[PDB]
């Protein structure tokens, strides 16, 4: 989030901060009582030691871990997508299992899930979150930021991104003149879109040509195509 403002404490309870030995890399999305949803590009090469990932549930500011609402949890399993391919950045989706259970609270609520064959019209306003970076060449933001980007069609996204291959599992989102979009360190954040007073998970920040650049929208992995793959693990 480069062109956003600070978010209210508790406005996004389903945003989990993933720390690798005390360092945030990519956000997650809690779905089940012990399952998470994060991008499969930041967990590439670290599935051998799941104990190195610490799941901080219900966190708002990265410098107030002693809050009475923070519930510490650990990762014990990292299931990357079977069809993942880092070189082509395809199937960028992964689930991370939690160590112990966590009770639901006003600051800990499971995120929604997109059902199969769900028509997402272009230009639809979607909300994002995550402790990203406020500028390309800068440092991370301590406060949980947020932003809004419209949905672009697959053909228009492919025309705007000739250097990449946007498959049928990649839903793009971003401004036409840039300015407000995802940045480095934020790839992995959820793409929340409102529908009937419900905030689904319509994408996960995967990659991007450059940050805070005009005519450069962000790429979000279409979670709607990986519905059964996630549901096979939630049980």
């Amino acid at each position: 989030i480069v062109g956003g403002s600070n978010a209210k404490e508790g406005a996004w309870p389903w945003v989990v901060g993933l720390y690798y030995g005390g360092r945030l890399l990519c956000g997650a999305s809690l779905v089940s009582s012990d399952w998470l949803v994060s991008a499969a590009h930041c967990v590439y090469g670290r599935n051998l030691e799941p104990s190195k990932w610490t799941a901080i549930l219900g966190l708002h500011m990265k410098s107030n871990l002693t809050s009475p609402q923070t519930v510490p949890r650990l990762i014990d399993e990292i299931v990357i997508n079977p069809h993942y391919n880092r070189r082509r950045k395809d199937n960028d989706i992964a689930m991370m299992h939690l160590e112990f259970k966590v009770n639901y609270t006003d600051y800990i609520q499971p995120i929604c899930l997109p059902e199969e064959n769900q028509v997402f019209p272009p230009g639809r306003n979607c909300s994002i979150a995550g402790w990203g970076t406020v500028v390309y060449q800068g440092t991370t933001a301590n406060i949980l930021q947020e932003a809004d980007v419209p949905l672009l069609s697959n053909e228009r996204c492919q025309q705007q991104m000739p250097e990449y291959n946007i498959t049928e599992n990649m839903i793009c989102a971003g401004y036409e003149e840039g300015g407000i979009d995802s940045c480095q360190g934020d790839s992995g954040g959820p793409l929340m879109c409102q529908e009937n007073n419900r905030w689904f998970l319509a994408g996960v920040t995967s990659f991007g040509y450059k940050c805070a650049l005009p005519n450069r929208p962000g790429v979000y992995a279409r979670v709607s195509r990986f519905t059964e793959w996630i549901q096979s693990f939630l049980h």
């Binding site: 403002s5 406005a11 309870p13 997508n81 006003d106 609520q109 499971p110 929604c112 905030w199 049980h235």
Partner: protein, 583 residues
């Protein structure tokens, strides 16, 4: 002139019965009844054989048979020795029954009948054996038989030679029971009355072997078939009796083994009832006796489709136990380095190892040495088999990684290396196989979950957690003919049958319970419409313990099918103290 039916001797002074001629006992005072010329058979011209060895044949052995001739052979050997009969060839009509009598005179004991079957080697433990061959058919398509007799000592036989018999060449030393209802038949290959009994021999694994089995004749009553063995000498150490039994049929009653001693006391040590499949079963029993004992395989056969067979009986001492790297390689290239592996590997390395194999053979990659760099350098093992490369495992760093079991016949391995801090490297070798990694699923209605263990019905959607992968509680209840996603019937599954449920005592409590079991939220509503499924619907009940009691009873009047409609779970609804600000 003697009485009608009697023939006088040579001296014409004593009248003896006609059946007493050539029977083995000297009835005439001058021994004329045992003369070789009067009892001369047209088969081979020899009646009495006193030598230790010899041979005998039928009428015109190397020619078709044209005349029915009654022939009889009586062999007497030295006392204390047994007579061993060896049948090299036997091909006659089923009406030409070869009778084997044990002893001479009217006290001769019949042991076995031979017809249209090669008897192999038949050993009688008597020094006087009377063999009679009666011709009844006139078919000239058969050749005949030729058998030789040899003398041996039965007192020097050990327990192994007496018990161990693979039944490939007749009966080794087994003596068929005389007080039973029927005798064992030696049939080769498939027997009569199909769909019952074994279809092939167990020793050779084909239909060319020989074994024993119950008579496949249409027996209308229950017949007992038993086989007696020679008395075994008592040993200081116990011995284990090993044998292969085949019990497949619809009317199998019981197959028991009795041990008979000198005091006529029978002791049952082995017993099997029911059907055990069309496969040879491994049966064993520990024999521990202080005196001489006998082994008796007494089979109780019922009516048609109750065949039982035995094979491979043996005895054993002891208690019964319980950028320019390599490319596609093949089987002769199991061991391989990556490209520069006797020491640390160079940077900017990117090689590929497409492991090839045959169609239907997976790949098992075992790493003998694996010392890589940090997260920057990893190894990606794939199972593409096509342009869409899959993923198997991501290994990196110095550590004993587990084995990799592929699925198809192709495996792509990519070595992603950085441009600084070169580590040592890795080393592995593959080995092709069949269904490696995945354990063999246990048969006989044994449900196998994801982890590999076997759980037939102890965890099939009942409320337990035996399988750690959670596949024991896999899909059994789901929506049936549902309009939307969270809509459908309440079709359950007890073991395999996917059937609906009843609504005799349907409530909202069990409604939301089933909704939670379906993975959805609580029960929004429940409206019965009409009954349409004919499957074994189950009456869902509840108990104060917490679990749901589901009795699959197929009995209900004016049943109703509940159209279950569950609401959504805790979706993305903001429950904190948030506001609405356009900024």
């Amino acid at each position: 002139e003697c009485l009608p039916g009697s023939s006088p001797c040579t001296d014409a002074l004593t009248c003896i019965k006609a059946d007493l001629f050539c029977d083995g006992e000297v009835n005439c005072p001058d021994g004329s009844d045992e003369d070789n010329k009067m009892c001369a058979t047209v088969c081979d011209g020899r009646f009495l054989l006193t030598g230790s060895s010899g041979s005998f044949q039928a009428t015109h052995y190397p020619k078709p048979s044209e005349t029915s001739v009654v022939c009889q052979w009586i062999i007497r050997v030295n006392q204390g020795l047994s007579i061993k009969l060896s049948f090299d060839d036997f091909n006659t009509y089923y009406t030409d029954i070869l009778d084997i009598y044990e002893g001479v005179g009217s006290s001769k004991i019949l042991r076995a009948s031979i017809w249209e079957t090669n008897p192999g080697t038949i050993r009688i433990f008597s020094n006087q054996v009377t063999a009679t061959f009666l011709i009844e058919s006139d078919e000239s398509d058969y050749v005949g038989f030729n058998a030789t007799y040899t003398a041996f000592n039965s007192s020097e036989l050990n327990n192994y030679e007496k018990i161990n018999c693979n039944f490939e060449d007749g009966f080794c030393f087994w003596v068929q029971d005389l007080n039973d209802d029927n005798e064992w038949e030696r049939i080769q290959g498939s027997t009569f009355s199909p769909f019952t009994g074994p279809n092939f021999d167990h020793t050779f694994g084909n239909a060319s072997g020989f074994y024993i089995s119950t008579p496949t004749g249409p027996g209308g009553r229950q017949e007992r078939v038993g086989l007696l063995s020679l008395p075994l000498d008592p040993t200081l150490e116990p011995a284990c009796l090993s044998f292969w039994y085949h019990m497949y049929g619809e009317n199998v009653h019981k197959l028991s083994i009795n041990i008979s001693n000198d005091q006529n006391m029978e002791k049952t040590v082995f017993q099997k009832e029911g059907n055990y499949g069309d496969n040879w079963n491994y049966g064993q029993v520990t024999l521990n006796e202080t005196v001489k004992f006998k082994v008796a395989f007494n089979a109780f056969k019922n009516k048609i489709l109750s065949d039982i067979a035995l094979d491979d009986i043996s005895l054993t001492y002891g208690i019964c136990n319980g950028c320019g790297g390599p490319f596609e390689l093949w089987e002769p290239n199991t061991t391989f380095s990556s490209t520069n592996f006797p020491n640390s590997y160079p940077n900017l390395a990117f090689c590929v190892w497409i492991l090839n194999a045959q169609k239907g053979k997976n790949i098992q990659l075992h790493f003998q040495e694996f010392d890589l760099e940090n997260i920057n350098d990893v190894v990606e093992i794939r199972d593409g088999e096509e342009a869409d490369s899959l993923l198997l495992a991501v290994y990196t760093g110095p550590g004993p990684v587990k084995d990799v079991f592929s699925t198809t016949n192709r495996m792509t391995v990519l070595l992603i290396t950085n441009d600084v801090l070169a580590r040592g490297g890795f080393k592995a070798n593959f080995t092709t196989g069949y269904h490696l990694g995945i354990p063999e699923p246990c048969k006989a209605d044994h449900f196998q979950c994801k982890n590999g263990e076997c759980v037939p019905l102890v965890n099939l959607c009942d409320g337990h957690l035996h399988c750690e992968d959670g596949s024991d509680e896999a899909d059994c209840v789901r929506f049936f003919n549902g309009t939307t996603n969270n809509n459908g019937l309440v079709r359950f599954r007890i073991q395999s049958i996917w059937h609906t449920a009843c609504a005799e005592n349907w409530t909202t409590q069990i409604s939301n319970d089933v909704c939670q079991l379906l993975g959805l939220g609580s029960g929004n509503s429940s409206k019965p419409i009409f009954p349409t499924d004919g499957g074994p619907f189950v009456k869902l009940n509840t108990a104060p313990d917490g679990h749901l009691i589901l009795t699959p009873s197929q009995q209900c009047l004016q049943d109703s099918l509940i159209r279950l409609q569950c609401n959504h779970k805790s979706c993305g609804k903001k429950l904190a103290a948030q506001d609405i600000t356009p900024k």
